[PDB]
Design a protein around this ligand. Sequence first.
Ligand SMILES: Cc1cc2nc3c(=O)[nH]c(=O)nc-3n(C[C@H](O)[C@H](O)[C@H](O)COP(=O)(O)O)c2cc1C
Ligand code: SF4
Ligand code: SF4
Ligand code: SF4
Ligand code: SF4
Ligand code: SF4
Ligand code: FES
Ligand code: FES
Ligand SMILES: [Zn+2]
Lengths: 88, 219, 110, 111, 429, 71, 251, 63
Amino acid sequence: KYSWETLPKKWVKKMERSEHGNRFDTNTDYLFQLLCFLKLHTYTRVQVLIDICGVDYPSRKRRFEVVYNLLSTRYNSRIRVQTSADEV
Amino acid sequence: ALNYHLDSPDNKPDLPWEFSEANQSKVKEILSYYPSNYKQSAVIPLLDLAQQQNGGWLPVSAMNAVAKVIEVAPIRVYEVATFYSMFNRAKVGKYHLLVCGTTPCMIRGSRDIESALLDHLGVKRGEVTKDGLFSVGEMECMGCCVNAPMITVADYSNGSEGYTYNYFEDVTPEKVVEIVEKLRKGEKPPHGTQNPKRIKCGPEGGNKTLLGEPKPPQF
Amino acid sequence: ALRRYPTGEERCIACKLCEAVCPAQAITIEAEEREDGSRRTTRYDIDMTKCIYCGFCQEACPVDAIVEGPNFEFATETHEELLYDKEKLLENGDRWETEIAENLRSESLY
Amino acid sequence: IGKVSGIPEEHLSRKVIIYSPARTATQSGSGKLGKWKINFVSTLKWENPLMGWTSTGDPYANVGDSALAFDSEEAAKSFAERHGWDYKVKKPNTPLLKVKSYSDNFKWKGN
Amino acid sequence: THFGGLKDEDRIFTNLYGLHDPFLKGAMKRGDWHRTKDLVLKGTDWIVNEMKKSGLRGRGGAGFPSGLKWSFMPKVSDGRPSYLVVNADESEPGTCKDREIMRHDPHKLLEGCLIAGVGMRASAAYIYIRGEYVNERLNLEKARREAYAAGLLGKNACGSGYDFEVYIHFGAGAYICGEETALLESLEGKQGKPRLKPPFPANAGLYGCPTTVTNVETVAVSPTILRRGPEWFSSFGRKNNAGTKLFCISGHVNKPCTVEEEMSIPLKELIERHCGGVRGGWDNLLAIIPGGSSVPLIPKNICEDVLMDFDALKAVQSGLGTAAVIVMDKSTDVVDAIARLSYFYKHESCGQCTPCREGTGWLWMIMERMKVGNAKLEEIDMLQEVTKQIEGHTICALGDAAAWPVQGLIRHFRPELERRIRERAEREL
Amino acid sequence: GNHTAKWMQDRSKKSPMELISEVPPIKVDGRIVACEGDTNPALGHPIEFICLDLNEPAICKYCGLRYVQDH
Amino acid sequence: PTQILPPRNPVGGARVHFSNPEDAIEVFVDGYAVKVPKGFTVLQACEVAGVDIPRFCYHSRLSIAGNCRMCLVEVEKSPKPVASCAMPALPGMKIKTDTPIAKKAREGVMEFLLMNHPLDCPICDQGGECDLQDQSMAFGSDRGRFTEMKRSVVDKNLGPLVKTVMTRCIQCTRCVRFASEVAGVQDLGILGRGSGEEIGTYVEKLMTSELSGNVIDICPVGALTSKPFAFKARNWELKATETIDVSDAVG
Amino acid sequence: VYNIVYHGRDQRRNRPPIRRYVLTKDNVVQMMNEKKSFDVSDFPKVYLTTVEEDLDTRGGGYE
Ligand SMILES: Cc1cc2nc3c(=O)[nH]c(=O)nc-3n(C[C@H](O)[C@H](O)[C@H](O)COP(=O)(O)O)c2cc1C
Ligand code: SF4
Ligand code: SF4
Ligand code: SF4
Ligand code: SF4
Ligand code: SF4
Ligand code: FES
Ligand code: FES
Ligand SMILES: [Zn+2]
């Protein structure tokens, strides 16, 4: 995927998937910075925050997982940047 | 054939049953074959002895007595009595004509054997005749195969003494009805091949191989 | 409506599949081996108010014991009546059987 | 993280039991083991006198079993200690895989 | 070479047809018990070695190389008295070759019990007579009482220093009890339900004591194999398969007979020579079940030039079991015959394991439908798949023995099955 | 009955237990019956094969119908 | 390439009891080595590997049996699928539990079991908690080709505790082993042969033994069910608490 | 209908397992050095969609 080559490696910190919709499980600090990327970028133009799905994993240490969906009306693709932030 | 027990005045675990004399000795011998422990090994011969002694079928009292003689829980004796086919658990009359029914008999007219025997006797398949004498029972391969159609009688008249499990082989409908009438008349028909011109298990035109007088070959 | 077999005998053997499949958990089923020996539901109470009328119970029931009668006209003055009692008011499907049996005889092809 | 969680005060003095549900003895299958669950005792369930059905009053009636299942005693204890519950962890009793073989049924009783 | 011709001085089972006295004073004249004292004194390793050198293979369905089987028994006895169960019980459909050894020269069987016992370090032989062989086991108990009175068996093996006693067990009408791992149990007193193979009978079989189950024909040719030449024995049959099998030409032959004849014999040659011929001429043949009933069919187009030896009949997509050749001519309903075979395997299946216990009743139901034509043209592929679901999965080879007749019937006479099905279809509408 | 006295308070319409205990047992031929349901195998219960080896009638658990051997 | 393999801990946290740390046999369960003590059946050598092999009659407390072939894993160099319950793990043995031959063997057997089995699942007391239902819905085929007359069996009277519906029973022999061995009373039996196999006392004989109500938990099928718990509830309604008992002092 | 083999037809469980492998700094610096240039066709294609006036020409108003 083109988006992973250009993206600074540090921004896609923890995880990265390759099916059922691709995701960049990033870190909470680099999130809005990562959302700044993929938008206002010529080859990755999302512009459309479809959804922000809170997901709660009680057995994790970072309980929640704020799943930002993102559609790219230009390139017709959908990326799901995620995070992980506990209750506080 | 039920694989469980339905009480009856003839057959119930209340009735006292035990090996008669001239059979206690056979019990002792049969148990002598197998070791002191593992005497459970003698449940097939003891059950067959009880079946011969009680005129052809195994009452639950008989299985309980075999269990007492053999020292295992009666369930193990019940398990073996319902498993093996030769052990009749309901009365099969005095003779229980067993006509084989496997393919090497079926292709050689054994279905006709059984149908002729049945319509002559007048029982469905395994029901005992109103005379209490005869009963027909299908049995799988009886070993008598080259002797193409066969019928095994189980003479239960006397009991453990006149108990003859004769093989009437190479039979035909006429031969079968003749055997049944000669059996109801009391006498014992000659077993073996009911078809002369062949010796036992022979090629039907006189054997073609075993002709020379036997002798020690060159060792 | 809880259906019945043509020869009386409530069709509802208490498997509890409809109590399980129910999305709103309207059906409360308690089962007891009746004296005849065949299982039956001592309590079969559908709470119509807590019920979404999705027909999942009609699909889940193995013997077609619970079916939805085309009634749809049972507006009740009081809420307690709207909670359909254990196998007594759902047993009024015997009146609707003439139409329920027709609908089932015509839908069973699907 | 008990006070910020909005849970009422009277339900943070609750006494829970962090067990691991044993295998359902009826079915010999381990596909539901290793899922540690907090067990809010939640014993108070009367019978609503109008209809035959029951009627709990404790909010934590079902969530102990339903939808709140961790994957390790450490995560479950961390959870029940964040929220300030008095957890008593009940360890799971695990089976010994004792060595056994077929040829032991046909053992010889010497004589 | 060209096999088949066995001269009357080369037949091992003399007095097969019971023409001469079976017991002693009639067996010593036929060479039985001739010099077994020397053989026992020649040792156990020599007996096993000569049996392996003679290339004697299993006379029973397994077809295993005997001798090599006898070398499986433990050498040093660890307290468990090694037994020797003789598989007299057959119950295979078509097979009477055992019935002509239990009676009609049983002393060969008793001397073979003794010679194999000293061969495999045994301590007692349990001749598991088939239950229905009442007259046969009476003759055999007569011969056993004789060989006991003549000091042959019991507390001194034919005057030698070997303590060996033959006990005669008899089952009760169960083909399943005949299996090697089920003989041990049906003789242990329990039901005739096979045990799984990981405990092998040579390691923990009868009473947990080691043992090897041998068909009467293999144990009974053992004496004459040793007294005659192991080179003489192996001089018959093809290279691997060697010996003189005891055949049983069973059905639809104008002269059905069991006759001993050299292995690797052309099936057609055996039929045309000894038992006469296929009823109505060879061109009237429909199919042949060459082994017992545990073996697929032979559709008469690969039955002309097939040899009655283990290897060739295995290479013809079949098996030589007890060599109880069942012949079927164009007049029989071959699907009905195989339906009755599957009924047999449904009846005589001790039901211990699910693939056989259930799938055999299933095979019987499908065969009793296809013999009328009540099935669908794709069931003939279900039947193949059902049989292949039964085959490899059952505890004992009875699962095989029940999937093989139907598999062979399909593989060969699929035209006839399909014809019956289409004729049923056109009978409707 | 007593079980039927828990859900039915009418006590004038015959209790289903009696409605099924008053229907006669159905004669059959073999040793196994079908009882697919009323008549239509798709409007009755899952087919329940009943054994008739016993002498007394063997009820179908789902429908209450009773079958006897009729030899 | 720096993968993250799952932990692969035993099937139920099962403590593996080495008789000594020297005789640990090393077998390959799906290409993942596991060190099992000497004598472990292939099934236990897989339960050490976290692989849950579907078993109908193999109870760890009870004896080992082949009354059905639901396990049939394919070891490397055997001609036929070996029953995992009785095959002792040999050092170096390669067990493939999910190879197409193993899965086809499992589907085959779960079709035979559901072939003569009655459609009693709705009226079966153990409808939700059933090994047969949960192995058919997980390893057995989605469809059944058997459309004929299933065999049926009368219901034996086994007392006021164990309600018996032997038609459902699959004749895996687990109970007839439990009553002979653990309960030690020897009343149950596998009467008959073939499909006609019937489990229970040959004469009407209430299971006079205590400790013989556990045959219901032993039973992988509804057949043997608690008659007191006749039908009163379902496997899903019941909220379970891991309480103890106070009747007898064994606790 | 008469071929009920399932593991071939299976969809729920007949899938390749999740391969979650870790990347350490060495791997990604290797990949960044390997990516020499972003030549065209290493770029995501645009979903080109323009608007075009049409009154009833598709089929003639009859579908
Ligand atoms: C399906 C099956 C059929 C068998 N049939 C026979 C038989 O007809 N006669 C017999 O003696 N043993 C029979 N056996 C037992 C063994 O296969 C084998 O014949 C015997 O244990 C040893 O014979 P052998 O030493 O000649 O190989 C059968 C076993 C199986 C599994
Ligand atoms: S339609 Fe049936 S299953 Fe659905 S909520 Fe209503 S009662 Fe429950
Ligand atoms: S209505 Fe249907 S699902 Fe509900 S208990 Fe009755 S039979 Fe079972
Ligand atoms: S079911 Fe078949 S394979 Fe299994 S023990 Fe019985 S006869 Fe042998
Ligand atoms: S045991 Fe009962 S619930 Fe399980 S499959 Fe059999 S009938 Fe259905
Ligand atoms: S009754 Fe239950 S435990 Fe006993 S054999 Fe049948 S299914 Fe197995
Ligand atoms: S045909 Fe097998 S014994 Fe008569
Ligand atoms: S349980 Fe292991 S194969 Fe039957
Ligand atoms: Zn019914």
